[PDB]
Design a protein around this ligand. Structure first.
Ligand SMILES: CC(=O)N[C@H]1[C@H](O[C@H]2[C@@H](O)[C@@H](CO)O[C@H](O[C@@H]3[C@H](O)[C@@H](O)[C@H](O[C@H]4[C@H](O)[C@@H](O)[C@H](O)O[C@@H]4CO)O[C@@H]3CO)[C@@H]2O)O[C@H](CO)[C@H](O)[C@@H]1O
Ligand SMILES: *[C@@H]1O[C@H](CO[C@@H]2O[C@@H](C)[C@@H](O)[C@@H](O)[C@@H]2O)[C@@H](O[C@@H]2O[C@H](CO)[C@@H](O)[C@H](O)[C@H]2NC(C)=O)[C@H](O)[C@H]1NC(C)=O
Ligand SMILES: *[C@@H]1O[C@H](CO)[C@@H](O[C@@H]2O[C@H](CO)[C@@H](O)[C@H](O)[C@H]2NC(C)=O)[C@H](O)[C@H]1NC(C)=O
Ligand SMILES: O=c1ccn([C@@H]2O[C@H](COP(=O)(O)OP(=O)(O)O)[C@@H](O)[C@H]2O)c(=O)[nH]1
Ligand SMILES: [Mn+2]
Length: 267
């Protein structure tokens, strides 16, 4: 489907249990390297395969283009299509990831779309997913159920009435990090072209899920996704799935902390 870069992976041969699709801009190589060295590192988690790919568009900068070409050659984990990679094109980026799952990895049990300034606890997420007994039409994250479009015209998330004309958004989950069963990717890709476009990707996915009659659900009886960020502690971070507002150096320090304290107890 018009992909400039495709990861060197074969989901038919080895169906992944969890696929992470990470959004980042071209210049954010430090982010991607920190992820590749921490929670993005591919491995078996309780015998389940984890795969990690980075979603990129294109840029006018020839230097950044060359950097990303070299990075894809070195790492083989970039999914790319020809669209200007800017904040207000994040919907295209998300749909690219979903398209990739649909076309090349329909075997994935679960897919997480996530920001790059994130800590992800794949071990705890896997444990909760294996416990949920939800393998189809499943979508979770930080649920946002009573959202009103932001009409402050200079706000980062401003939408005009022509861009989104109704008083409330559909139910959706924070774009910082949400998780869905793999079949959901095909259903969303199928309905996407008939659903009204909006430049905020997490709202757009919510519109698609609503058209599909897919209901959002909480992953666990306790909160596990934290778009607002969290005060760090080892014992807390062992029992969450996702935390936002984490720069690369911090991500590396937190990962080291969890390694250093492996084998201690907590509650
Ligand atoms: C994190 C997230 O999921 N973002 C989505 C966003 O969610 C925000 C929305 O629910 C609003 C509703 O009032 O509340 C939260 O946002 C807070 C403030 O209301 C918001 O104004 C602020 O945003 C920026 C702020 O305007 C600036 O002055 C400040 O300098 O920087 C702020 C961030 O850059 O942020 C806080 C918390 O983030 C929710 O976070 O909803 C939109 C759609 O409206 C979209 O789906 C986002 O993906
Ligand atoms: C997810 O399911 C497990 C297993 O329960 C069995 O399989 C399910 C698909 C469903 O058909 C159940 O009725 C089956 O009994 C649940 O874990 C078990 O739950 C029972 C009752 O609480 C308990 O006796 C077992 O020891 C549990 N552990 C096992 C079987 O390993 C689990 O509760 C289900 N998850 C949720 C969120 O309900
Ligand atoms: C999102 O990406 C699309 C595709 O790259 C952009 O649309 C193109 O914009 C360039 C100029 O930036 C035009 O020359 C092309 O004709 C457009 N092509 C298509 C297919 O749209 C779009 O501008 C980007 N969005 C934002 C907000 O930057
Ligand atoms: O041109 C862009 C801008 C942002 N992003 C990614 O989109 C997500 C949201 O951006 P950011 O974290 O800057 O927004 P915030 O969390 O501050 O609202 C992050 O993973 C960015 O790396 C991207 O892929 N391309
Ligand atoms: Mn972010």
């Amino acid at each position: 489907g018009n992909f400039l870069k495709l990861p060197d992976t074969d989901c038919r041969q080895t169906p992944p249990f969890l696929v992470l699709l990470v959004t980042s801009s071209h210049k954010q190589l430090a982010e991607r390297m920190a992820i590749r060295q921490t929670w993005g590192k591919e491995r078996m988690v309780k015998g389940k395969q984890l795969k990690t790919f980075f979603l990129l568009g294109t840029t006018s900068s020839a230097a950044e283009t060359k950097e990303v070409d070299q990075e894809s050659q070195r790492h083989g984990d970039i999914i790319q299509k020809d669209f200007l990679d800017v904040y207000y094109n994040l919907t295209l980026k998300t749909m690219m990831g979903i398209e990739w799952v649909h076309r090349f990895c329909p075997q994935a049990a679960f897919v997480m779309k996530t920001d790059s300034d994130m800590f992800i606890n794949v071990d705890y997420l896997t444990e909760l997913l294996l416990k949920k007994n939800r393998t189809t039409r499943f979508f979770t994250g930080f649920l946002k159920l009573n959202e009103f479009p932001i009409r402050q015209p200079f706000s980062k998330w401003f939408v005009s009435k022509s861009e989104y004309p109704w008083d409330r958004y559909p139910p959706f989950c924070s774009g910082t990090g949400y998780v869905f069963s793999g079949d959901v990717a095909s259903q969303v890709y199928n309905v996407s072209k008939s659903v009204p476009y909006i430049k905020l990707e997490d709202v757009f996915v919510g519109l698609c899920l609503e058209r599909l009659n897919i209901r959002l659900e909480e992953l666990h009886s306790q909160p596990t996704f934290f778009p607002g960020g969290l005060r760090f502690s080892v014992c807390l971070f062992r029992r969450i799935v996702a935390c936002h507002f984490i720069k690369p150096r911090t991500l590396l320090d937190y990962w080291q902390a969890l390694e250093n304290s492996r084998g201690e107890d907590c509650p």
